């Protein structure tokens, strides 16, 4: 059935999906998308779509798939189907190198949120108390915003159209902190450009964040999902996902 497909991406989330000097779409999602389509024997075409409206445009049939650093989270699973994860990454916090937030002790280094034990709640409640009075910035319509609204409601948040504006305002001093995956924050903080920025706090997984990043497909497209899952399994097994992860992220975030 599928001879050619249209894949949507945002183009504002480096190193997953962004634009080069000549304005062409580049990144991990573009390289993986093209490699998966070569395996599937499907012609590949990448389109730019803003984050707000990326899910409704998929359901409306404007394109066939989404490859835009999209977590397989339970709220999204109610609307669209996902492929098996092509990348696994926890979530962490971001601040400036001079922030007093960096002197706060982390009791639980890795925080799994599917089940929240009293000890895990105590750690989340500690950070909530510390984050009150502190200005937070998040990209709108992400699991970052969902986390802040559900798990830390007492904390003041500002929502941004893109993650680039969040980073811009954090450097300008208009916000004091943020949150994203380690897959986004490690290559951002590894840059000598961003020596003034630091990752801090616990590394969270599960709950509302779900498990991994997957390809977004329509629920009625069961055959396209099966094709993507077979292609992803083969790309993981031969070391392609590991090779592309080292290239774009500077570390191995591929599933095992
Ligand atoms: C991996 C990535 N996932 C977030 C943010 C992705 C936003 N993607 C985009 N702007 N293209 C999410 O699915 O809510 C992250 O937490 O860092
Ligand atoms: Cl491209
Ligand atoms: Cl093949
Ligand atoms: Cl799975
Ligand atoms: Cl431990
Ligand atoms: Cl190769
Ligand atoms: Cl290459
Ligand atoms: Cl590594």
Author numbering: 27 to 282
From the paper:
Two Agrobacterium ABC-transporters and their cognate periplasmic binding proteins (PBPs) OccJ and NocT import octopine and nopaline/octopine, respectively. OccJ shares 47% sequence identity with NocT and belongs to cluster F within the PBP structural classification.
In parallel, we produced the corresponding reciprocal mutant in NocT, in which Gly97 was replaced by a serine. As expected, the presence of the serine at position 97 in NocT abolished the nopaline binding ability whereas octopine binding was preserved but with a 10-fold lower affinity compared with the WT. Therefore, in contrast to OccJ, a serine at position 97 does not favour high affinity for octopine in NocT. We thus validated that the presence of Gly97 in NocT was essential for the spatial accommodation of the α-ketoglutarate moiety of nopaline. Moreover, Ser97 exhibits different conformations in both molecules of the asymmetric unit of the NocT-G97S-octopine structure and each of it is not compatible with a bound nopaline. Replacing Gly97 with a serine lead to a selective octopine binding protein by restricting the opine volume. Indeed, the NocT mutant can no longer accommodate nopaline, which is bulkier than octopine.
